[PDB]
Amino acid sequence: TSKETFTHYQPQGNSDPAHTATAPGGLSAKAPAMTPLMLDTSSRKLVAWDGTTDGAAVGILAVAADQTSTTLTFYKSGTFRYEDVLWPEAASDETKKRTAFAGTAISIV
Amino acid sequence: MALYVSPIVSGEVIRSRGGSTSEFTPGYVKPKHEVNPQMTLRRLPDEDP
Numbered sequence: 001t002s003k004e005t006f007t008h009y010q011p012q013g014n015s016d017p018a019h020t021a022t023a024p025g026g027l028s029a030k031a032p033a034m035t036p037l038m039l040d041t042s043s044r045k046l047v048a049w050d051g052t053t054d055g056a057a058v059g060i061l062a063v064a065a066d067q068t069s070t071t072l073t074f075y076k077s078g079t080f081r082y083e084d085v086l087w088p089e090a091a092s093d094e095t096k097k098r099t100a101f102a103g104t105a106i107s108i109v
Numbered sequence: 110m111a112l113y114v115s116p117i118v119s120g121e122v123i124r125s126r127g128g129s130t131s132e133f134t135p136g137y138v139k140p141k142h143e144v145n146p147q148m149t150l151r152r153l154p155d156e157d158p
Contacts, residue, residue: 062117
């Protein structure tokens, strides 16, 4: 009938530390946790990753924020399970998403 | 303050404080008085006659 499936919640995928940092944000819509971020080329603020600008990934959002928020706290290191990161809809190929964060400390498992 | 930070995204640390010092050295005073060795032969306003 109504079997509530109690599952865990492990965004982490490796024993690597998940270091955080605070940076200004200029988001234009609601953004839940574990959303990729990119650095704006014009204003150099932090916005939601479009999923098309290759190599623009800068980090992963940690605490949900909105357009009214001025500073966002985002992850800058560690490994995240591929099924828990809320990729933007514009990214339609798994390979590009997997290697999008290469170069920084962020990795996808 | 320590406003909200949740036990997943622990962040900023605090600073120790201090930084004041002043020195106020010398001070001095000495009010010397006389003994009047020849005033004792008379009688004082005390010492009823």
